[PDB]
């Protein structure tokens, strides 16, 4: 037996590779994976009728000696018309470049599901793998251990809740701009290693690094290594990276800024060992790499990194955990999250001082080191790893995806796992603002959980709502809600435990857990509402209209409390409390929250943002003074701006 805690994966040559820990790094190549295809028999046919027809035909095209196939009763409840609620299908296991079209019409069957199945999705669904977990299971990778398996059935998930220590490496990159070619070149790189980050226990504040090293080339604490050019530096970088072999690469704006630069410089300078940025070994870059397609290039980089988790604190995901930030500049994030001050140094290596001024160069290198240490500490403080891990386990997708910031990612998997487990066949892949200055405290009330509560209250599902699948624009009448209910209940149990919990450690962990559950539930709507693999216009509309009724009554309730709605939409409603006191305003806000819940017992709104003053200009365009309470109750004012001219690049 072989035990590995899997972290990430990658697809190559119709195989699936898993990278994880066994603690050393390891990769497992998975062969024998098949797409599960489901052939829908015609009126008066059986799975055997299909079996006789297509199987001999499939053996020929794909050239297989034998193909596993069996009858299986499956349910279907999605948007494809003429397909029945339940039928006997022929399940064909077709091993993993020519795909079988879904409209394969024959005298036996008329439809086929799972034709374009993705290999990772197939593995995860079939083996019921729910995110990063423990699994009981030459020169292909940068890992310490390289193994393969002949069949995916050899891999089964374990119940173990704990996880191994991770190897994190914080990166900080200082660049230079060459005006000739308009190319951002790399001047220095800081590498800070934290070889034993345990997410099973809280990470100690101001945690000390196991190793700190800085590499630098001429533009014109820890070890410091000097190089004669950029190429030698980057070669050394790749080698050090391979030896360190981190599970996580931490940084600030890596995803869409510094990681792209790094890759492109390794490409430009023809660095042969570039692939150590990930855990898969490659001799050559992808053919279409550097075709000027800023969109496709991003995919290539993410792919090459496969095996190492990219922990970016300033990406779409990271920003969501630091809403009190406004610019999300490294110094700003450090202040907001850790309440510590850092004055950012503006380093411009084009400046001539850096060529001969040893103290200038030294000051710049010190700035880079500090930034690296800051990035790591922030990532641990905001607990980006733990939350994204939880979200991945809840949705059952890839950790890499979560750390990235996708919308059709945890919202598609969560549904594929629920429905597949319950024997279903899955599909193939507002109030005008009161413009002006508001002198009284305005409270932003968050109705994120509007839709989930609506879907749960009225029991809205693909399985419950009779709808016209021919006409999606037809409004219909009043699995998914049960799943929602489970998430809500779990969240309740966590909060109940929080009231009693005394350990600051266990407490904080509980807070993360409930946050993950909340985000998972509040992302369920996008599944059927955004134009999504599970998109269903009749269901989206049905939910929206009930959302309109609820909001209308809500407006009436606010007015009933003599409050004025300054602005509102499906996500939030801002209410003028009419007070000039933080306390009086909060009492008003709580009364409003309670009032709404009495009318809609499954709809739980809360006070999200307190504006001492609010200058509202348009829907999503305003300036305001947010009040942030400190540990000792102490209240502090801060300026917050959204959508104004002042937010345009300059």
């Amino acid at each position: 037996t072989f035990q590995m805690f899997w972290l990430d994966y990658c697809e190559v040559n119709n195989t699936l590779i898993l990278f994880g820990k066994v603690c050393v790094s390891a990769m497992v190549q998975i062969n024998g994976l098949c797409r599960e295809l489901f052939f829908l028999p015609r009126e008066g046919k059986t799975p055997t009728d299909i079996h006789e027809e297509i199987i001999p035909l499939l053996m020929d095209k794909y050239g297989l000696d034998n193909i596993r196939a069996k009858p299986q009763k499956m349910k279907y409840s999605f948007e494809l018309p003429d397909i029945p609620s339940e039928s006997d299908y022929l399940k064909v296991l077709l091993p993993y470049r020519d795909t079988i079209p879904s409209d394969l019409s024959s005298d036996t069957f008329y439809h086929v599901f799972g034709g374009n199945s993705n290999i990772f999705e197939s593995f995860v669904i079939q083996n019921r793998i729910m995110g990063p977990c423990w699994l009981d299971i030459r020169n292909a990778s940068h890992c310490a251990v390289e193994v393969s398996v002949d069949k995916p059935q050899n891999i089964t998930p374990t119940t173990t809740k704990t996880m191994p220590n991770l190897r994190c490496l914080s990166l900080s990159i200082q660049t230079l701009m060459n005006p000739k070619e308009n190319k951002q070149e790399i001047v220095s790189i800081t590498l800070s290693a934290y070889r034993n980050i345990s997410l099973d226990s809280p990470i100690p504040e101001n945690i000390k690094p196991d190793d700190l090293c800085t590499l630098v080339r001429p533009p014109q604490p820890g070890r410091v290594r000097l190089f004669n050019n950029e190429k030698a530096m980057l070669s050394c970088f790749c080698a050090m990276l391979k030896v360190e072999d981190p599970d996580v690469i931490i940084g600030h704006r890596l995803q869409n800024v510094y990681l792209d630069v790094l890759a492109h410089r390794m490409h430009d300078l023809n660095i042969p060992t570039f692939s150590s940025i990930g855990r898969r070994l490659r001799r050559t870059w992808p053919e279409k790499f550097g075709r000027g397609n800023s969109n496709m290039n991003h995919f290539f980089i993410s792919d090459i990194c496969s095996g190492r988790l990219i922990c970016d604190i300033a990406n779409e995901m990271g920003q969501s955990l630091t809403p009190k930030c406004q610019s999300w500049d490294l110094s700003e994030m450090y202040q907001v999250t850790c309440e510590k001050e850092h004055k950012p140094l503006d380093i411009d290596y084009q400046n001539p001082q850096y060529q001969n001024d040893v103290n200038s160069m030294t000051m710049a290198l010190q700035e880079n080191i500090t930034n690296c240490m800051i990035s790591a500490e922030v990532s641990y403080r905001i607990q980006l790893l733990t939350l994204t891990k939880q979200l991945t386990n809840l949705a059952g997708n890839a950790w890499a995806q979560t750390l990235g910031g996708t919308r059709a990612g945890r919202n598609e998997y969560i549904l594929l796992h629920e429905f597949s487990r319950n024997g279903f066949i899955v599909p193939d892949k507002v109030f005008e603002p009161e413009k002006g200055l508001h002198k009284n405290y305005v409270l932003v009330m968050d109705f994120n959980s509007l839709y989930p509560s609506i879907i749960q209250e009225f029991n809205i599902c693909f399985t419950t709502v009779d709808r016209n699948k021919e006409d999606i624009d037809e409004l219909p009448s009043v699995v998914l809600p049960r799943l929602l209910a489970n998430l809500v209940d779990r969240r309740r149990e966590v909060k109940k435990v929080m009231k009693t919990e005394t350990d600051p450690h266990k407490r904080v962990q509980c807070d993360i857990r409930q946050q993950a559950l909340k985000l998972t539930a509040n992302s369920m709507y996008g599944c059927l509402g955004y134009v999504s693999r599970f998109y269903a216009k009749p269901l989206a509309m049905l939910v929206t209209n009930k959302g309109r009724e609820i909001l209308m009554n809500t407006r009436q309730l606010a007015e009933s409390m003599n409050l004025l709605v300054v602005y509102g939409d499906t996500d939030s409603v801002m209410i003028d409390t009419g007070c000039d006191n933080y306390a009086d305003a909060i009492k008003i806000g709580l009364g409003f929250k309670r009032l709404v819940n009495e009318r809609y017992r499954l709809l739980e709104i809360d006070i999200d943002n307190v504006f001492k003053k609010l200058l509202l200009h348009a829907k999503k365009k305003y300036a305001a003074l947010t009040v942030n309470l400190d540990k000792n109750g102490n209240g502090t004012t801060v300026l917050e701006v959204k959508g104004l001219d002042m937010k345009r690049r300059e």
Binding site: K435, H617, A618, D645
Partner: protein, 60 residues
């Protein structure tokens, strides 16, 4: 009256956009200072811009 490009400009004239300046209506000095109207233009001052023939007909 016009039986992407215009809504914002009209709100901007009311101090509802950008720097939120509540622009003062133009006085005659300001109107007269603008580039002289040509064919197809109706801004300016008819006492300066129209012929005596046109003004006389209007005043009659």
């Amino acid at each position: 009256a016009f039986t992407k490009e215009y809504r914002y400009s009209f709100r901007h004239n009311y101090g509802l956009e950008g720097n939120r300046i509540n622009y003062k209506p133009w006085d005659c000095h300001t109107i007269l200072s603008k580039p002289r109207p040509g064919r197809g233009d109706y801004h300016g001052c008819p006492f300066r811009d129209w012929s005596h023939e046109r003004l006389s007909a209007e005043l009659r």
